[model samples]
Target chain A: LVAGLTPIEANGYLDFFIDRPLGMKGYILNLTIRGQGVVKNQGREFVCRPGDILLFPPGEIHHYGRHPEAREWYHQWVYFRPRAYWHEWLNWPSIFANTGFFRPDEAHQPHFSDLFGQIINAGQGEGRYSELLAINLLEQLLLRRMEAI
Target chain B: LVAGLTPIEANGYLDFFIDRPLGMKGYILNLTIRGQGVVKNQGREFVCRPGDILLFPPGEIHHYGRHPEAREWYHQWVYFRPRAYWHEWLNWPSIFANTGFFRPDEAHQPHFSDLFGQIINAGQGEGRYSELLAINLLEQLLLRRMEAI
Candidate 1:
């Protein structure tokens, strides 16, 4: 997971594990705060900046890289969900991996940022209801990223 | 999934299976030519009128009922997706039942309906980058539904 404002310098490429099967459910939520960066996986590039929220749902392979001397600022992210959410249609255990965030471009950053804001606010608010709202916001944000693909 | 539009005079219930997990996926795009009714599922409800557009993504259930003997209205809709698409995550067997349309209330219905209008327009208009815009609109619609829950 990545989030907030800061400069990120990449010293090397880090390999991530393809932890689950195709049918297993999960999601990635990333909000770029500032600076510029590139996400490459499966031979594709996803460029993003502030207010840019991206999603990487389960079933694909991917990775992230930072420039050697430049800083890339972003926000917090998490991947989760059980297999029951996908209805057994997804093919898990395919040893799949792909590159790029759910949203491949930055032109729609503002709208995404607003939606991200809603999620963050809901998470920070009091009560179980508010927390649930945060989850919904997160889902919506991911839905946008998936649809963009 | 039952989206009960009006209070039923007699006892009745409607059940539906999503049949697929549509995370940020759009379904039949068409105008509600007739049977603009309210849908129900779980503890919520949503109203729909003729000529209105509707959409529901993952993590929700949607079903509708007509006014008793009022009229049989036609509902027109279409579905589409972006390139290099993948639904490996949608295949998880358990999620099949959890993935359905949400029965929204009055507060979120306007925003959801509004998203439908924007999505239809974006789909109709010509642009090299409108697909991404449509995805964003769909995400917003999902977010509003989350608010009601």
Candidate 2:
């Protein structure tokens, strides 16, 4: 059986340089809409720029922050869990677990932005329908990622 | 414009061991069923068995044979080309050109078998639709492979 489809946590227009050494507090999806953020994991530094959608598994040790000199970094994020839901909902759960990053190609940026906008708007409704809508939007985004691959 | 979808060359129930250092005369899709056959390419030998599918690019150099004691090895094959069509028709044409073999997993084997069966039956018609059907069946097989991945 599937669990309720609503974001446990959702935030938008986040502009900061917070450092979290143990990755996310929970399983979360992070999308960098503007500027850049540096994520350090397993001794490798990855830059998340505009249109880069990243996934951070709960408790995976890593530090993520923006450059001190940069003006500001903007982002929108949603967190969900129970882990089992991911295996049921995602097409390539193992691959997603292994590669936590995906950057939409140039042609798909518009579609990505549109879908993200819908998710952000829907997440504000504070109801079961809003949650299902958010989940559905995210699922479409993931399917597009698969098609691009 | 696309050329009529058709196998420029095809053969079924090929039951003998063959050795070709320079591979086939054209781009080919080969399915091996019953007994076993050996394919040697780039200093590596590949054995084809039931549910094994092999691809040979236009000029890939390879040698293949089977042991006399194994009785008869049966295979069905189709050849098509202009090379460009492959790029247009297959999702991972680049990857296919690089890795020439695929062993359908248990879950995918039945669908692969059904599609291949359709292709073999369609090719005998010698009509435009026949060729298109063969090509379409192959495309479905490739798409299924992508989904499995």
Candidate 3:
């Protein structure tokens, strides 16, 4: 399980989907922002933590729940594709490992946090390199995590 | 300068061009990849190491070569801009930084090395997403370096 930070939002549901078409493509990365990021797939349950960065590839399904008052489950997210990266021909969890885009610089975390906001906002509006920059920022975030590891 | 594991090759000549003909109506990512990457307006010799990543904003007259072999300095490059990314309100350097897309990782030297091959092959072939993948790969390479610092 990859460790990651969580956001404490109102009691709400969190679900992840792929950038391509849903049911047709899988998520390149699924991050759970909770003290314990729990996921369900094929009738099984999995849990993750604040420092853990969980990677969910395409074709699998994940669902989770969070409570705002608990201060343990509110989180933010940024999803994207690597410009020309092919989404098919994927195997397991290791494909994400091969990207080699993580680093451990505490200085960049806030920038990354800001970048996440930028990504979500970019995707929401049709900006020029929004899709491309979002991917760039996501790769930056992973590079930070790789450094921690 | 970012020392690289792989040796970089150069085309021993200078290139200068404008994008107005393409209906691009603005500056471009001006580039001169030589001794350590820098803004074209800096007017320095602009040295480049194997893994050093540089960005040249649009609409600048740029070129390189004093490549005498050992003074044999050599570097090759191309210019590109997303059709929608150019903003006329910023300075060239500020625009370049705000459009920072060439950042690299400090540890994964291989990714940058791999970029040389991708660029060469892409330039010689016809493939979908070739340029896009090249750009994204370049980002991964520099993102690694940025993390290192």
Candidate 4:
């Protein structure tokens, strides 16, 4: 998705909730490392906890916020413009591309942090070419996520 | 920095502070997109607001948390293993390389979101090559962050 990229931190405490009726202009990938979060969309509810991830595609009306009982919902999110073929990996096996969410096992879970790190690092970069490299990193990151789930 | 990558949902509400006497194991590049964050390190306090970023290098004893007056400190951070020469760009101009903090102008500010998007995307990629790609993306992202500030 070279059109644009959204870094995490964009990060925050979800004391309330984000109910995007119109959804986002781009896709969203999120990680919940601490506390907790709840997402409702397409008639289903997903609880995102530590080591969990959710990929919300563009135009998929979704609602997300802190867990009802948690003091705050701490989560990282990035808004990305999806590529033409990403859906293939994103949907893998079958297709329930709707508000996609899943939790990986320990074997693959460790790499998650580095995922967000590059976002921070790349976003923090400065230069005329910074944008291109940042977007390229996003492409690779998307491909990387496809297999992690 | 590919030895380890810490994703953002390690994203949370810092109501108090993170007083790391021993500092972090690697490096942390953070973006405060919302609310505010306070970082006290090397005898100086940094107030990180929207559009501000701080890179905490290894073993650089630092203390950070929510601003005393803010409701919550919202930020995204990625822990990265720094490359040998990355610091050259990260600490541009001359040196004040203590806690690398900066804010770019509108021309460069917009790309920040995508930076995080790739981290989530690359980290989420699947397959045997996922790790390599993710690491490569981090390298590029690191290079990217070098210039943005």
Model 2 C-alpha lDDT per residue in residues B79-137, reported as the tens digit of each score: 66623333533333332234366777888887786677666766555554455445545
lDDT of 1 by residue, B80-130 (tens): 442222232122222134423343366655555556667656555466445
Which candidate wins on lDDT?
4
Chain A: TM-score in each model? 0.52, 0.70, 0.50, 0.74
Residue pairs with clashing backbones, model 2 = none
In Å, residue A129's CA in model 1 sits off its true spot by: 1.1
In the order shown, the candidates' DockQ scores are 0.05, 0.01, 0.10, 0.25
Error of 3 at A50 (Å): 2.1
Which residue runs of candidate 4 sit more than 4 Å off their true CA positions?
A1-14, A92-97, A124-127, A146-149, B1-149
Could you tell me which 10 consecutive residues in candidate 1 chain B have the lowest summed lDDT? B1-10
Which tens-of-lDDT digit does each residue in B39-146 have in candidate 3?
Answer: 323334444444544444444334433333332333434334433322322222332223333434555545554554444444344554444444444443333333
The candidate scoring highest on DockQ is 4
Model 3 chain A is weakest, by summed lDDT over 10 consecutive residues, at A95-104
What is the Cα-based lDDT of residue A119 in candidate 1? Answer: 67
- Candidate 2 lDDT, tens digit per residue, A55-95? 66666554566644445556677665533334533433322
| Deviating ranges (above 4 Å) for candidate 3 | A1-28, A67-72, A78-118, A139-149, B1-149
Instruction: Report the error of model 1 at residue A114, Å.
Output: 1.7
Q: Locate the minimum summed-lDDT window of 10 residues in model 4 chain B.
A: B1-10
Task: Report the number of the highest-TM-score candidate.
Answer: 4
